[PDB]
């Protein structure tokens, strides 16, 4: 009949006049199941939000000139805009993100077409103003050029880059990848005009902090 404390993750329990616990006869608390009824690895559940997901496809046609914008992605708000995405449910609690980013631009061009899209990365405080930047210089950014011919995929890794130490989930704070027309495509006839572009993203180095009520926004850095 003494003081018993109990602590799990955030919550904690300080009890007075405790009673010794009970357990069923011959208990076995080993978590894993052997033999296995599931082939998956038991670390799946926490790992799951890291899964790579289709993101914001766009359609790039003839008519669009240079400097035009094919598609747009707001980076940090991109992985859970809806309830459908895997990282949503667990991001609907914790209010901050230290996470790094992995985005793989998928593209398919029918052989015999020529032109280029550029996949760049613009952080938020940069993204605030397009009007300042010369177009010819966008290659200063972390980026990858994509040739129509002989490029299936463009793999670019983005480390966390932002002013404040931690960034708010529900906002745009990480900025986002914007895909621009480096040169117009050239189509011989007959060919399908629209060349579909799908930005197939991912996420790595998962982090969350600073609990909040499920639906409510909270200010942190400002």
């Amino acid at each position: 009949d003494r003081v018993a404390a109990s602590t799990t993750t955030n919550a904690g329990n300080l009890v007075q006049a405790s009673v010794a616990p009970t357990m069923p006869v011959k208990p076995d608390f080993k978590n894993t199941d052997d033999f296995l009824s599931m082939s998956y690895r038991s670390t799946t559940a926490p790992t799951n939000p890291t899964k790579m997901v289709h993101l914001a496809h766009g359609t790039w046609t003839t008519n669009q000139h240079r400097q035009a914008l094919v598609a747009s992605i707001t980076l940090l708000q991109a992985f859970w805009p809806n309830q459908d995405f895997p990282a949503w449910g667990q991001s609907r609690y914790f209010a901050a993100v230290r996470c790094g980013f992995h985005i793989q631009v998928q593209l398919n061009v029918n052989i015999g077409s020529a032109g280029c899209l550029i996949a760049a990365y613009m952080p938020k405080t940069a993204h605030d103003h397009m009007n300042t930047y010369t177009f010819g210089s966008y290659t200063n950014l972390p980026h990858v050029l994509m040739n129509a011919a002989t490029t299936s995929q463009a793999d670019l890794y983005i480390p966390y880059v932002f002013n404040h130490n931690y960034a708010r989930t529900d906002s745009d704070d990480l900025g986002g990848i914007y895909i621009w027309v480096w040169s117009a495509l050239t189509v011989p006839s007959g060919s399908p005009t629209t060349v579909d572009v799908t930005i197939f993203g991912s996420l790595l180095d998962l982090d969350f902090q600073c609990p909040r009520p499920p639906g409510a926004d909270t200010v942190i850095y400002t």
């Binding site: 010369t134 050029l145 850095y221």
Partner: protein, 212 residues
């Protein structure tokens, strides 16, 4: 023989390169630039020091703002990152952190002392902290004289971004002054020079604004 050269392996060296595979952007920095039979690549230092090095270039200060002060009331003066000068070379980078010098230059027809104080947070920290500037790091400047006082980095934002004009985290600071000694037409001029800057991440070269 002497004149001719041939492939087929080293055609990389003669300048044929696939831009589609760039590696990292920094991987291109390692790339050996192409050369023909006759070119001599030699690094020739005409000066001992390098004007190209980040440390040196921003040592030269640059002039931001001029105003006369006839009134003892505390003067709000806001410092944007440099435009229209060699300081604009810093416009390539968003994130910047480092301590910065301030050279203020006092001109007083009638003898006047003037005070200088700097606050990274603006006038409003959520309370008005501008009531008296004595406690915030004031450094007093004699009449017809100037001083080199430098400001340490105190910010709740570890990295200032150059581009934005937003008063909260964007600027490199906000400067406070007031005259003392019952005077008028005390005129100041203030110069801002960085010290051992740390610039992080690049941006594309900015457009010249004719329309502002």
């Amino acid at each position: 023989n002497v004149e001719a050269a041939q492939g087929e392996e080293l055609a990389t060296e003669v300048g044929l390169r696939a831009t589609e595979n760039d590696g990292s952007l920094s991987e291109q920095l390692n790339m050996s630039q192409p050369m023909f039979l006759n070119f001599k690549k030699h690094k020739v230092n005409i000066y001992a020091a390098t004007h190209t090095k980040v440390d040196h270039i921003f040592g030269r200060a640059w002039a931001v703002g001029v105003f006369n002060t006839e009134t003892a009331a505390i003067q709000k003066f806001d410092l944007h990152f440099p435009t229209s000068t060699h300081g604009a070379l810093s416009r390539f980078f968003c994130h910047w952190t480092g301590e910065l010098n301030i050279h203020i230059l006092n001109v007083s027809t009638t003898n006047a002392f003037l005070k200088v104080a700097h606050t990274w947070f603006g006038t409003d920290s959520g309370i008005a902290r501008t009531a008296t500037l004595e406690s915030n790091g004031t450094m007093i400047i004699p009449p017809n004289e100037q001083m080199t006082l430098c400001v340490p980095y105190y910010s709740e934002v570890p990295l200032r971004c150059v581009k934005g004009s937003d008063r909260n985290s964007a600027g490199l600071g906000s400067l406070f002054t007031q005259a003392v000694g019952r005077t008028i037409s005390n005129r100041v001029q203030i110069f801002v020079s960085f010290r051992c800057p740390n610039f992080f991440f690049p941006l594309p070269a900015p457009r010249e604004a004719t329309s502002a």
